[PDB]
Design an enzyme around this catalytic site. Structure first.
Site, PDB file in Angstrom:
ATOM      1  N   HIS A 122       9.419   5.071   0.611  1.00 12.99           N
ATOM      2  CA  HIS A 122      10.248   5.079  -0.656  1.00 12.99           C
ATOM      3  C   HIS A 122      10.417   6.511  -1.010  1.00 12.99           C
ATOM      4  CE1 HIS A 122       9.406   0.699  -1.346  1.00 12.99           C
ATOM      5  NE2 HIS A 122       8.224   0.992  -0.775  1.00 12.99           N
ATOM      6  N   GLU A 149       6.491   5.496  -5.609  1.00 13.42           N
ATOM      7  CA  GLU A 149       6.405   4.316  -6.490  1.00 13.42           C
ATOM      8  C   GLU A 149       5.263   4.436  -7.474  1.00 13.42           C
ATOM      9  OE1 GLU A 149       7.013   0.774  -3.764  1.00 13.42           O
ATOM     10  OE2 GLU A 149       8.763   1.038  -5.046  1.00 13.42           O
ATOM     11  N   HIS A 185       4.161   3.171   2.826  1.00 13.32           N
ATOM     12  CA  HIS A 185       3.388   1.934   2.712  1.00 13.32           C
ATOM     13  C   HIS A 185       3.144   1.394   4.114  1.00 13.32           C
ATOM     14  CE1 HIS A 185       4.940   1.325  -1.582  1.00 13.32           C
ATOM     15  NE2 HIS A 185       3.849   2.145  -1.514  1.00 13.32           N
ATOM     16  N   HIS A 238       6.828   1.486   5.995  1.00 11.51           N
ATOM     17  CA  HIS A 238       8.114   1.945   5.512  1.00 11.51           C
ATOM     18  C   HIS A 238       7.896   2.923   4.400  1.00 11.51           C
ATOM     19  CE1 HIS A 238       6.824  -1.295   2.766  1.00 11.51           C
ATOM     20  NE2 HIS A 238       7.310  -0.444   1.819  1.00 11.51           N
ATOM     21  N   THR A 274       6.193  -4.420  -4.275  1.00 13.17           N
ATOM     22  CA  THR A 274       7.052  -3.682  -5.198  1.00 13.17           C
ATOM     23  C   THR A 274       8.555  -3.975  -4.941  1.00 13.17           C
ATOM     24  OG1 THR A 274       7.295  -1.820  -3.712  1.00 13.17           O
ATOM     25  CG2 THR A 274       5.407  -1.755  -5.249  1.00 13.17           C
ATOM     26  N   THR A 275       8.865  -4.879  -3.984  1.00 15.84           N
ATOM     27  CA  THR A 275      10.151  -5.296  -3.682  1.00 15.84           C
ATOM     28  C   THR A 275      10.214  -6.824  -3.828  1.00 15.84           C
ATOM     29  OG1 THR A 275       9.303  -5.506  -1.398  1.00 15.84           O
ATOM     30  CG2 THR A 275      10.515  -3.508  -1.993  1.00 15.84           C
ATOM     31  N   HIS A 320      17.213  -1.420   2.690  1.00 16.09           N
ATOM     32  CA  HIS A 320      16.305  -1.123   1.542  1.00 16.09           C
ATOM     33  C   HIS A 320      15.411   0.071   1.816  1.00 16.09           C
ATOM     34  CE1 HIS A 320      17.626  -5.042  -0.091  1.00 16.09           C
ATOM     35  NE2 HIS A 320      17.186  -5.606   1.026  1.00 16.09           N
TER      36      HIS A 320
HETATM   37  N1  LIG Z   1       6.731  -2.024  -0.975  1.00 17.11           N
HETATM   38  S1  LIG Z   1       5.597  -2.991  -0.522  1.00 17.11           S
HETATM   39  O1  LIG Z   1       4.655  -2.330   0.380  1.00 17.11           O
HETATM   40  O2  LIG Z   1       4.990  -3.647  -1.668  1.00 17.11           O
HETATM   41  C1  LIG Z   1       6.184  -4.328   0.540  1.00 17.11           C
HETATM   42  C2  LIG Z   1       7.452  -4.296   1.060  1.00 17.11           C
HETATM   43  F1  LIG Z   1       8.378  -3.402   0.714  1.00 17.11           F
HETATM   44  C3  LIG Z   1       7.786  -5.223   2.054  1.00 17.11           C
HETATM   45  F2  LIG Z   1       9.055  -5.149   2.489  1.00 17.11           F
HETATM   46  C4  LIG Z   1       6.884  -6.198   2.534  1.00 17.11           C
HETATM   47  S2  LIG Z   1       7.113  -7.420   3.857  1.00 17.11           S
HETATM   48  O3  LIG Z   1       5.984  -7.176   4.951  1.00 17.11           O
HETATM   49  O4  LIG Z   1       8.527  -7.101   4.284  1.00 17.11           O
HETATM   50  C5  LIG Z   1       6.954  -9.109   3.427  1.00 17.11           C
HETATM   51  C6  LIG Z   1       6.548 -10.017   4.574  1.00 17.11           C
HETATM   52  O5  LIG Z   1       7.693 -10.534   5.159  1.00 17.11           O
HETATM   53  C7  LIG Z   1       5.635  -6.222   1.945  1.00 17.11           C
HETATM   54  F3  LIG Z   1       4.661  -7.114   2.264  1.00 17.11           F
HETATM   55  C8  LIG Z   1       5.277  -5.254   1.017  1.00 17.11           C
HETATM   56  F4  LIG Z   1       4.058  -5.296   0.507  1.00 17.11           F
HETATM   57 ZN   LIG Z   2       6.837  -0.262  -0.109  1.00 18.83          ZN
END
Ligand SMILES: NS(=O)(=O)c1c(F)c(F)c(S(=O)(=O)CCO)c(F)c1F
Ligand SMILES: [Zn+2]
Ligand SMILES: NS(=O)(=O)c1c(F)c(F)c(S(=O)(=O)CCO)c(F)c1F
Lengths: 261, 261
Positions: free
Chosen positions: A91, A102, A115, A89, A196-197, A64
């Site tokens: 996007h 995003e 993020h 990570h 957002t996922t 992803h």
């Molecule tokens: N895109 S985002 O920042 O909203 C987002 C993610 F993409 C995400 F993968 C996680 S996470 O930390 O993987 C969930 C806890 O297991 C998130 F917690 C998370 F907030």
């Molecule tokens: Zn994210």
């Protein structure tokens, strides 16, 4: 599993992930009409972001995004609870339409978005337990645009070659994650929203820095073209591109700003 | 029971209407990275749009937009089959946020949007039949901005109160539909897309005129407060506001323009 394109794309997430069709969904357009200065929004403090150069941190392609695992002693100070880091990570879009943030600002995407995910470690033992719980998560978002070469982002991008396919993992030596943050981190947008996922839980306190960072044309192209969302042996490879969610309706709500100027 | 807000809103449409999660979905953001001039896009001719003032045409609440039924002798000339009119309807925002177009241009919403729906009458006996066939439908979209009072649009808006609730019908005297189109209809965006509501069939040839029309603040407020999605006698009334879909991903799709620039 869920994807950003085709039959398992974002219009279908709510079938297996009901919160993706519920309240408080992110990301959103940040535009003047819904902004409100809130003098209460003081600077965050980034603690433990200077990761030991003597430690290594796991980088993973999870099909992803590309994610860097972060240690739980790294945290934000200034919110109602301590929020400890769990991962970062990105996007992005694609080279033909390199506008894959995003969040949008006045209807405009940025090239990409970083993020840094934190969880409420005063309440929960880890991010997976927190993620579906009240006040579980806090995410810092940095908007990314094309401009000058960024040595700090290259501390992650120089390893993308080792995480090309889904499931692959490499190690990144510690470096100061605060270098990935923009100028004047005192200036930010804040609102309550969601992952957002999938599973899109409405459990995220968002802080989106006002000012973008820059990376070079080459770095952005590298991020857009380095990774695949499929396993190495998959006879139908797919490039990991356009891994952002469309903006969500946001009505009769405000986004608070720490800046008026 | 689909809606535009809350648990049966657009992220959930694909649970009942699979094509809403499929390909070729509309609306989209029309922006430079996905546009390409196409000199073969010659002007449309609008035939039988001057409807007799002595005749009347049915306006109805269907709980989604107000639609005006149009006669099949009204048609577009210039496409690869004759497309005969079936209905027109609108999409809009709400009094506190008059920004409810479906298509956006360079990330900006317009106040509202008019769709004039046509079906391929050379091939099919009616729009319902056409609607689930490839290029069965051709929709004209007019972007509407807040500006001067528009007497032509007022020929529709003045009848809204007879169609305040779901299932109500009224008669509108004929007028010249072409008066609802903007300046320089020769300049338009063209792409293959879908219905923007359930069942979201990917069967529309879209033409979005480049230039918006204006209606006034008072006309927008009237439109945004005139209508309900619910029956007269419903004990849980719901205002017909914000009846626009978010823009959809569009990659490895181009939008063709009849204007260079
Ligand atoms: N895109 S985002 O920042 O909203 C987002 C993610 F993409 C995400 F993968 C996680 S996470 O930390 O993987 C969930 C806890 O297991 C998130 F917690 C998370 F907030
Ligand atoms: Zn994210
Ligand atoms: N607002 S829009 O123009 O794209 C649109 C629709 F969304 C739509 F659903 C229909 S529909 O063909 O009447 C329903 C088909 O069963 C339409 F005819 C139609 F024109």
């Amino acid at each position: 599993k869920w994807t950003y394109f085709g039959p398992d794309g974002e219009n279908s997430w709510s079938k297996k992930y009901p919160s993706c069709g519920g309240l408080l969904q992110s990301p959103i357009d940040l535009h003047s009409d819904i902004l409100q200065y809130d003098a209460s929004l003081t600077p965050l403090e980034f603690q433990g972001y200077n990761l030991s150069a003597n430690k290594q941190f796991l980088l993973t392609n999870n099909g992803h995004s590309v994610k860097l695992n972060l240690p739980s002693d790294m945290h934000i100070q200034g919110l109602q609870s301590r929020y400890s880091a769990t991962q970062l990570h990105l996007h992005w879009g694609n080279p033909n339409d390199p506008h894959g943030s995003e969040h949008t600002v006045s209807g405009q995407h940025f090239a990409a978005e970083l993020h840094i995910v934190h969880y409420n470690s005063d309440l929960y033992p880890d991010a997976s337990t927190a993620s579906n719980k009240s006040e579980g998560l806090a995410v810092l978002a940095v908007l990314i645009e094309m401009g000058s070469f960024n040595p700090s982002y290259d501390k992650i991008f120089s390893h993308l070659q080792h995480v090309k396919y889904k499931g692959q993992e490499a190690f990144v030596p510690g470096f100061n994650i605060e270098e990935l943050l923009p100028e004047r981190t005192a200036e930010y947008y804040r609102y309550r929203g969601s992952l957002t996922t999938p599973p899109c839980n409405p459990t995220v306190l968002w802080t989106v820095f006002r000012n973008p960072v820059q990376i070079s044309q080459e770095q952005l192209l590298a991020l857009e073209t380095a990774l695949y969302c499929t396993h190495m042996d998959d006879p139908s490879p797919r490039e990991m591109i356009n891994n952002f969610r469309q903006v969500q309706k946001f009505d009769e709500r405000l986004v608070y700003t720490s800046f008026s100027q």
